[PDB]
């Protein structure tokens, strides 16, 4: 559209922008327009978070220490599902990753893949990972299937805020204000928040902004039940570690802003 974006459909993601649209979070989400059909699709109708920018560069970290629902792992069991998609994906970053079963069948089942990915990533040791960047010269870089390590991590945040301190300064207000945010949403401390990104864009004007997106696996708990989004997850137990993620977020870009 104009100053919108289409996004494909799904029922999940609709009832937590239905929410989050009346939610503190508010703020640090695309505004949500409705629904729409066209060329023979569904799809969610949504703000282009890049409308307001002149060049911006784009950074996506999948955020938490658990990346897969958990009726994928106790569905994993009762009824086992191997991928072809998701062995290759993994033989072309990690040959011999797979077991010499995983070899034979040319598949693995998807928690096996996410959780071989979450602990490649710095995700199992961060509680978040970057999955894209694109930058002002026109660059960008989606591998990031082997950043792992601390420092690792660190070098890529500097070479996307680019030595500007400011820039910097303005994505930890971002993110301290959030945090805020989350710590008394209803619809956090009520929802398990997997697969979902905060994106980072900012300009050579100085704008700067976080979003949350990706709200295809954000599902409601059980009446009256919440999370901490900070223990440790154990399968039974629900958690996150969406805000151990973020806590480490913050940590590490003031430690850049310091520099
Ligand atoms: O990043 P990778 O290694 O390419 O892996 C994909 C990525 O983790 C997506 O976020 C995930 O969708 P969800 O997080 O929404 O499950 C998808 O599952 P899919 O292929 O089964 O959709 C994976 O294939």
Same mark, same amino acid.
């Given at each position: 559209?104009?100053?919108?974006?289409?996004?494909?459909?799904?029922?999940? @993601?609709? =009832?937590?922008?239905?929410?989050?649209?009346?939610?503190?979070?508010?703020?640090?989400?695309?505004?949500?327009?409705? %629904?729409?059909?066209?060329? $023979?699709?569904?799809? /969610?109708? %949504?703000?282009?978070?890049?409308?307001?920018?002149?060049?911006?560069?784009?950074?996506?970290?999948?955020?938490? #220490?658990?990346?897969?629902?958990? *009726?994928?792992?106790?569905?994993?069991?009762?009824?086992? =599902?191997?991928?072809?998609? %998701?062995?290759?994906?993994?033989?072309?970053?990690?040959?011999?990753?797979?077991?010499?079963? *995983?070899?034979?069948?040319?598949?693995? +089942?998807?928690?096996?893949?996410?959780?071989?990915?979450?602990?490649?990533?710095?995700?199992?040791?961060?509680?978040? =990972?970057?999955?894209?960047?694109?930058?002002?010269?026109?660059?960008? /870089? +989606?591998?990031?299937?082997?950043?792992?390590?601390?420092?690792?991590?660190?070098?890529?945040?500097?070479?996307?805020?680019? $030595?500007?301190?400011?820039?910097?300064?303005?994505?930890?207000?971002?993110?301290?204000?959030?945090?805020?945010?989350?710590?008394?949403?209803?619809?956090?401390?009520?929802?398990?928040?997997?697969?979902?990104?905060?994106?980072?864009?900012?300009?050579?004007?100085?704008?700067?902004?976080?979003?949350?997106?990706?709200?295809?696996? +954000?599902?409601?708990?059980?009446?009256?039940?919440?999370? #901490?989004?900070?223990?440790?997850?154990? *399968?039974? /137990?629900? @958690?996150?570690?969406?805000?151990? $993620?973020?806590?480490?977020?913050?940590?590490?870009?003031?430690?850049?802003?310091?520099?």
């Amino acid at each position: 559209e104009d100053g919108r974006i289409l996004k494909r459909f799904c029922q999940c @993601e609709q =009832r937590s922008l239905e929410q989050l649209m009346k939610d503190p979070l508010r703020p640090f989400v695309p505004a949500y327009y409705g %629904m729409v059909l066209q060329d $023979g699709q569904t799809f /969610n109708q %949504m703000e282009d978070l890049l409308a307001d920018f002149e060049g911006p560069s784009i950074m996506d970290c999948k955020m938490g #220490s658990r990346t897969y629902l958990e *009726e994928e792992l106790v569905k994993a069991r009762e009824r086992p =599902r191997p991928r072809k998609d %998701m062995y290759e994906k993994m033989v072309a970053v990690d040959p011999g990753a797979p077991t010499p079963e *995983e070899h034979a069948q040319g598949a693995v +089942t998807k928690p096996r893949y996410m959780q071989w990915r979450e602990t490649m990533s710095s995700t199992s040791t961060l509680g978040f =990972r970057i999955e894209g960047i694109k930058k002002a010269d026109g660059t960008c /870089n +989606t591998n990031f299937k082997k950043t792992q390590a601390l420092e690792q991590v660190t070098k890529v945040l500097e070479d996307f805020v680019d $030595g500007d301190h400011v820039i910097l300064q303005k994505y930890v207000a971002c993110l301290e204000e959030l945090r805020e945010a989350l710590e008394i949403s209803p619809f956090f401390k009520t929802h398990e928040v997997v697969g979902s990104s905060l994106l980072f864009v900012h300009d050579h004007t100085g704008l700067a902004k976080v979003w949350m997106i990706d709200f295809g696996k +954000t599902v409601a708990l059980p009446d009256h039940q919440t999370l #901490s989004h900070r223990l440790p997850w154990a *399968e039974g /137990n629900r @958690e996150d570690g969406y805000l151990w $993620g973020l806590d480490n977020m913050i940590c590490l870009l003031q430690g850049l802003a310091q520099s």
